[PDB]
Design a binder for these strands. Structure first.
Ligand SMILES: Nc1ncnc2c1ncn2[C@@H]1O[C@H](COP(=O)(O)OP(=O)(O)OP(=O)(O)O)[C@@H](O)[C@H]1O
Ligand SMILES: Nc1nc2c(ncn2[C@@H]2O[C@H](COP(=O)(O)OP(=O)(O)O)[C@@H](O)[C@H]2O)c(=O)[nH]1
Ligand SMILES: [Mg+2]
Lengths: 192, 80, 101, 349, 202
RNA sequence: AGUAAACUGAGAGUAGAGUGCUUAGUUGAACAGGGCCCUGAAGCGCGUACA
C-alpha cells in the first residue's frame, strides 16, 4: 500500500493515523471481495511495487573474449578484466596475486567469487587497483572480479552471488571524527 | 669513473674482461695457442653475449633478457 | 583612536620594528655567524641590546584588529574568534558557510 | 619414490620422484644447512626424501663433465623464494660426498653478516673482524662432514696461534681444525687456514673440491654489524667474508664452486629481489662473473603431484579432503606450485 | 550500523542452496522465495565456504586476539593445532598396537573434546532477595566460559617463558584427558554450586 | 561496528614553544541476554500534607 503521506498528497488533504487505517482496511476488504479487473484497476492506484547488470563481452585484438568491470571499497578502486577462458592466473598491477597480496586473507578474498561459482582455474584475470589499505584493496578487487565474472556465469549463478553478497557494494565506510569526541563515537573520557 | 655513466659500456668492462679471461682459460686448457683478444672477440658468440649483457645492464631486466643471457653464456662456455 | 592602550602599544611596537628592521637585520646577521672575531660579535651584541627594546619583533602581538583580543585570533582574517563567528553567522564573510560533512 | 639411492646413477629418468637420504648420510654430510622446516619434516617422518629435479640433475651432469684441470668453474642457482635451491645444493652435496669429494659447504652467508655479538679484532690482521662463534660452528660442521679427509690432508705451512703456540708444516688438517674449535679465539684464523690449504691442495689434486655456498648474495652486499664506535662494517672487514670471497675466486683448480642465491634473511633487500644482479649487486656480479646461472622455479604439475602423494602417503595431510582432487586443486591454487608455500600450508593441513 | 534494519545477514552454506526443491517444505519454500526480495549484508571477511572452516576455532582465535593482530592470532592457533598433532603422532609411534587404537591423532577432535570437558554445567550469579546463587548456564555462556578459562589459564604468569602454542597444546591435551587446572576450575565452580545449594531458593 | 582498541600522518596557533586541541587514514573485534536492591523515567496508583 501507499504510505499515509503518499495518500495525503494524493488527496491534497490532511488525514490522521486512524483515517489512514480506516482507508487501508476498506481497501483490504475490497481486495478480499474477489475484486475483478474493473476494481483491481482502481485498487492498483493505491498499490506500490517493491538484478545485476550483465556487462557486454568484449573482444581483444586476438579475438579472445573478456568482460571488464569495476568496483570500489573504502578508498580503494579496482578495475578487473576477466577472460572467458583462462588458467586461473590473476595478475594484479602487473604482479602475481600471491606476490602482491602477501596475506592469505586477501588471497581468500580474491578466491571467494570464483570459488563460489566453482570457476577457479577457468578464468584469467587482470586487476588494476589503486588507493586505500590492503584490506580495502582486497575488497575492491573482489567486488570487481565478481562483477566481471557475472557476465560469464549464468543468470541463476549471478543471482546466487548477489544473494551471497559478492555483488553487493559495501556501504560500510569510515565514519568521520566528530568535534569534541576522540572518535566517530568515542566520547572523551568523561571528566568529573 | 664508471660510477659516473648512466649507460653501461661492455668495452673495458668487468664482464668483458671476465668473459675474455674465461675464454683464455678454456683455450689454454685445450692447449691450442691459436687464440688472441681480437680473435676471441670477433666471433659472433661474443657479440651475442655482449648484446645480452648490455641489454640486462641498461634495459629493464626480465625473463626474456635473462633467458637470452643464459643462452649466450651456454654457447660461450660450450655447455648444453 | 585605537581600541585600547594595549592595541596602541602594539601599533607603536609595529611602527618601531618596521623602522628599525634593517639595522636589526644586519646587526643580527653579524652576531649570528662563526667567522668574525668574538670581540666584533660582542660589540654587535651590545649594539643590538642598546637598540630600543620595543623595536624587537618578538614584542609584537597579533591582537584582533577589531577588538584587540590578545588570544584566539585567526591570522588569515586578523579577527578574534568572537567577531569572526558573529560575521560568519551573519553571512558577511563571502564563501564561508556552516559545518556539515 | 625411486629405488636408486646412489647419487651418481640417477638421471632424468627418475625425474618427479623422491630420493631418500639415509639417516647416517644425513648426519655426516648434512649436520647443518638444511632448511629448518624441512628439518622439522624429517624429524616428523624419519625420512629425508628430496624429489630429484632438472636443476639438480643439470648441476650433477655439470660436475660429471667438469674437468678438474680447468680452473674451478662457478655455478649459480638463482630464483624466487622457496623454490628448493637449498635442497638441490644439498642433493648435489650428497652426490659429491658419495663421490668422495671434499665439500666446502657454507650453510648460509646471511647469518655471518648480522647479529654477531662476539665480534673481536683479527690478530692476524688488525684491520679485520672475527666471528668466533660462527667460525667454531662452521668448523664443527666441516669436521662432521669431512673427518675422513681431515686426517688424510696435511698442512703446508707454519701457523702461529700464540707467541709460543704454533702448528708445523706437514701436520694433519685435523690439528688445525681442533685448534680452531677448542680455541674459539683462533676459530676464524683456523677457518682461513683451512680455506687456503684446501684451495692449494685442490690445485695440487690431493682431492676434488665442491665449494657449495648457500645464499651467496650476502658476501658482496651490506652488513648490520656495528663497531664499538657504532660505525658500520663492510663485508671485507670480516675475515670469514674476505676468505670466502678468496674461495669464490676461480683462480684455483681441482674442483668447482657451486652457489645458490637466497633472499631469505637478506639485509636491506626488498622482499621481491630475486634476480642474480638484484641480489649480488655490482660487486657480487663482478666477483662471480664468469658463472653458469641455473634457474630454480616453482613445481610443475608432475612434481606437484609427486610432493602431494608423498605427503598423503606419509599421512601428513591428516585432514579429510587432502587426498581429494578438489583439495589438491586448492593447494595448487594457493601455492602456485611453490614448494615453500605448499609445505607451509600442508603443515597445518 | 550503516546497514538499515532491512538488511539480513547472508547465509553461507552450499548444501542449503543445493537442496532439491522437492525435499523443501512449504515453509522452507516460502522462506527461500522471501529471501529473494530482502537485502543481504556484505559477507564478513572471517567466514567463507571452505570445507576446513571451523566457527569454534575462529571464535577461539578472535578471543585470543589482542588489539587487532588477527594474523598473530591465526598463527598461534595453527601452531597449537600442529603441536597437538605432533605430540599425538609421537605417542602413537611410541604406543603398542592395542594402545594405538585408543590413541587419537586429530587436533580438531582433541580441541573440541577438551573444550567440552572444560565447559561448566552450572555457574553462580548474584541473585537479590545480594546472594551468590547456583544458577543454570545457557549453552553459549558455557562455551564462552570454557574458552575464556582456557585462554586465561594459558595467559597465567606461572608459565615462565613458555610460548603460547606449547602452553595451549599442553593445556588442551590435559583437558582432553580430563585433567589440568581448567578442569580443576570447573570442579571448583561445581563445588561452590553444591555448597550454595541451600541458597538456591533465593 | 568500521564502533572500541592500537598505530601512523597532517592542520590551528608562535620567532620558538603541548604528552594539549583539531583532523585524515590504516588493521579492527566481544557481548547485545537477564533483571530493578541502587539511580533515574513512566503508568497502576496509594498516602502526606501545606500554598
Ligand atoms: N626436491 C624437493 N624435495 C622435497 N621437498 C622439496 C623439494 N624442493 C622443495 N621442497 C620443499 O619446499 C620447501 C620450501 O623450500 P625452501 O624455502 O626451504 O627452499 P629455498 O629455495 O632455499 O627457499 P627460501 O628462499 O625460502 O630459503 C622445503 O621445505 C621442502 O619441504
Ligand atoms: N693465526 C694465523 N692465521 C693464519 C696464518 N697463516 C694464515 N692464516 C689465516 O689464513 C687466512 C689466509 O691467509 P692469506 O690469504 O695468505 O693472508 P692475506 O692474503 O694477507 O689476507 C688469513 O686470513 C689468516 O687469518 C698464521 O700463521 N697464523
Ligand atoms: Mg633452498
Amino acid at each position: 500500500w501507499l504510505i499515509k503521506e503518499e495518500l495525503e498528497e494524493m488527496l491534497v488533504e490532511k488525514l490522521s493515523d486512524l483515517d489512514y487505517m480506516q482507508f487501508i482496511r476498506l481497501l483490504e476488504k475490497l481486495l478480499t471481495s474477489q475484486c475483478g479487473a474493473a476494481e483491481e484497476e482502481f485498487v492498483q492506484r493505491f498499490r506500490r511495487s517493491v538484478k545485476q547488470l550483465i556487462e557486454p563481452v568484449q573482444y581483444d585484438e586476438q579475438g579472445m573474449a573478456f568482460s571488464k568491470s569495476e568496483g570500489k571499497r573504502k578508498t580503494a578502486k579496482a578495475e578487473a578484466i576477466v577472460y572467458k577462458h583462462g588458467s586461473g592466473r590473476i595478475k594484479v598491477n602487473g604482479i602475481d596475486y600471491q606476490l602482491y597480496f602477501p596475506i592469505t586473507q586477501d588471497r581468500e578474498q580474491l578466491m571467494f567469487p570464483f570459488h563460489f561459482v566453482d570457476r577457479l582455474g577457468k578464468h584469467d584475470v587482470t586487476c588494476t587497483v589503486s588507493g586505500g589499505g590492503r584490506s580495502a584493496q582486497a575488497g575492491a578487487i573482489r567486488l570487481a572480479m565478481a562483477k566481471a565474472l557475472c557476465s560469464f556465469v549464468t543468470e541463476d549463478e549471478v543471482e546466487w552471488m548477489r544473494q551471497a553478497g559478492l555483488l553487493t557494494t559495501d556501504p560500510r565506510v569510515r565514519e568521520r571524527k566528530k568535534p569534541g569526541q576522540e572518535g566517530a563515537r568515542r566520547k572523551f573520557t568523561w571528566k568529573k | 669513473t664508471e660510477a659516473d655513466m648512466e649507460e653501461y659500456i661492455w668495452e673495458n668492462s668487468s664482464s668483458e674482461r671476465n668473459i675474455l679471461e674465461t675464454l683464455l682459460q678454456m683455450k689454454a686448457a685445450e692447449k691450442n695457442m691459436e687464440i688472441n683478444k681480437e680473435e676471441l672477440l670477433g666471433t659472433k658468440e661474443i657479440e651475442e653475449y655482449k648484446k645480452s649483457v648490455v641489454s640486462l645492464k641498461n634495459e629493464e631486466e626480465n625473463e626474456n633478457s635473462i633467458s637470452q643471457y643464459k643462452e649466450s653464456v651456454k654457447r660461450l662456455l660450450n655447455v648444453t | 583612536h585605537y581600541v585600547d592602550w594595549r592595541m596602541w602599544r602594539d601599533v607603536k611596537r609595529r611602527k618601531m620594528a618596521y623602522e628599525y628592521a634593517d639595522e636589526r637585520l644586519r646587526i643580527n646577521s653579524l652576531r649570528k655567524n662563526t667567522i668574525l672575531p668574538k670581540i666584533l660579535q660582542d660589540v654587535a651584541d651590545e649594539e643590538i641590546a642598546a637598540l630600543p627594546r620595543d623595536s624587537c619583533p618578538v614584542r609584537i602581538r597579533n591582537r584582533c584588529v577589531m577588538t584587540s583580543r590578545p588570544r584566539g585570533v585567526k591570522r588569515r582574517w586578523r579577527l578574534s574568534r568572537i567577531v569572526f563567528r558573529h560575521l560568519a553567522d551573519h553571512g558577511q564573510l563571502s564563501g564561508i558557510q556552516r559545518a556539515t560533512w | 619414490r625411486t629405488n636408486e639411492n646412489d647419487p651418481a646413477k640417477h638421471g632424468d629418468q627418475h625425474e618427479g620422484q623422491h630420493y631418500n637420504i639415509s639417516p647416517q648420510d644425513l648426519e655426516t654430510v648434512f649436520p647443518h644447512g638444511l632448511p629448518p622446516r624441512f628439518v622439522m619434516q624429517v624429524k616428523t617422518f624419519s625420512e629425508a626424501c628430496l624429489m630429484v629435479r632438472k636443476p639438480a640433475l643439470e648441476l650433477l651432469h655439470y660436475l660429471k663433465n667438469t674437468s678438474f684441470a680447468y680452473p674451478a668453474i662457478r655455478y649459480l642457482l638463482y630464483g624466487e623464494k622457496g623454490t628448493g635451491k637449498t635442497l638441490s645444493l644439498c642433493h648435489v652435496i650428497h652426490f659429491c660426498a658419495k663421490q668422495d669429494w671434499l665439500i666446502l659447504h657454507i650453510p648460509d652467508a646471511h647469518l655471518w653478516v648480522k647479529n654477531c655479538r662476539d665480534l673481536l679484532q683479527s690478530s692476524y690482521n688488525k684491520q679485520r673482524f672475527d666471528q668466533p662463534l660462527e667460525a667454531s660452528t662452521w668448523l664443527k660442521n666441516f669436521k662432521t662432514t669431512n673427518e675422513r679427509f681431515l686426517n688424510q690432508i696435511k698442512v703446508q705451512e707454519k701457523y702461529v696461534w700464540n707467541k709460543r703456540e704454533s702448528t708445523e708444516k706437514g701436520s694433519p688438517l685435523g690439528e688445525v681444525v681442533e685448534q680452531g674449535i677448542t680455541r674459539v679465539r683462533n676459530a676464524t684464523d683456523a677457518v682461513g687456514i683451512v680455506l687456503k690449504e684446501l684451495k692449494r691442495q685442490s690445485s695440487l689434486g690431493m682431492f676434488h673440491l665442491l665449494v657449495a655456498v648457500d645464499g651467496i648474495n650476502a658476501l658482496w652486499g651490506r652488513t648490520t654489524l656495528k663497531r664499538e664506535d657504532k660505525s658500520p662494517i663492510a663485508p671485507e672487514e670480516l675475515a670469514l667474508v674476505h676468505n670466502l670471497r678468496k674461495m669464490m675466486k676461480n683462480d684455483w683448480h681441482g674442483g668447482a664452486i657451486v652457489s645458490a642465491l637466497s633472499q631469505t634473511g637478506s639485509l636491506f633487500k626488498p622482499r621481491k629481489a630475486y634476480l642474480p644482479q638484484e641480489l649480488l649487486g655490482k660487486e657480487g656480479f663482478d666477483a662471480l662473473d664468469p658463472f653458469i646461472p641455473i634457474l630454480v622455479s616453482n613445481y610443475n604439475p608432475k612434481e606437484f603431484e609427486s610432493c602431494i602423494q608423498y605427503y598423503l602417503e606419509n599421512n601428513w595431510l591428516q585432514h579429510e579432503k587432502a587426498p581429494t582432487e578438489e583439495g589438491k586443486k586448492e593447494l595448487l591454487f594457493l601455492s602456485n606450485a611453490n614448494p615453500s608455500l605448499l609445505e607451509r600450508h600442508c603443515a597445518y593441513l | 550500523s550503516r546497514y538499515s534494519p532491512e538488511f539480513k545477514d547472508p547465509l553461507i552454506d552450499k548444501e542449503y542452496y543445493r537442496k532439491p526443491v522437492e525435499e523443501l517444505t512449504e515453509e522452507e519454500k516460502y522462506v527461500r522465495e522471501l529471501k529473494k526480495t530482502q537485502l543481504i549484508k556484505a559477507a564478513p571477511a572471517g567466514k567463507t565456504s571452505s570445507v576446513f572452516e571451523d566457527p569454534v576455532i575462529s571464535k577461539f582465535t578472535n578471543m585470543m586476539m589482542i588489539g587487532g593482530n588477527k594474523v598473530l592470532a591465526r598463527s598461534l592457533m595453527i601452531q597449537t593445532l600442529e603441536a597437538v598433532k605432533r605430540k599425538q603422532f609421537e605417542k602413537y609411534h611410541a604406543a603398542s598396537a592395542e594402545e594405538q587404537a585408543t590413541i587419537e591423532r586429530n587436533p580438531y577432535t582433541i580441541f573440541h573434546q577438551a573444550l567440552k570437558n572444560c565447559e561448566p554445567m552450572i555457574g553462580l550469579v548474584p541473585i537479590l532477595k545480594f546472594y551468590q546463587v547456583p544458577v543454570p548456564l545457557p549453552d553459549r555462556r558455557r562455551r564462552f566460559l570454557a574458552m575464556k578459562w582456557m585462554i586465561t589459564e594459558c595467559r597465567d604468569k606461572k608459565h615462565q617463558r613458555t610460548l603460547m602454542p606449547e602452553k595451549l597444546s599442553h593445556k588442551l591435551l590435559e583437558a582432553f584427558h580430563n585433567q589440568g587446572p581448567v578442569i580443576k576450575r570447573k570442579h571448583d565452580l561445581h563445588k561452590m554450586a553444591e555448597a550454595n545449594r541451600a541458597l538456591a531458593h533465593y
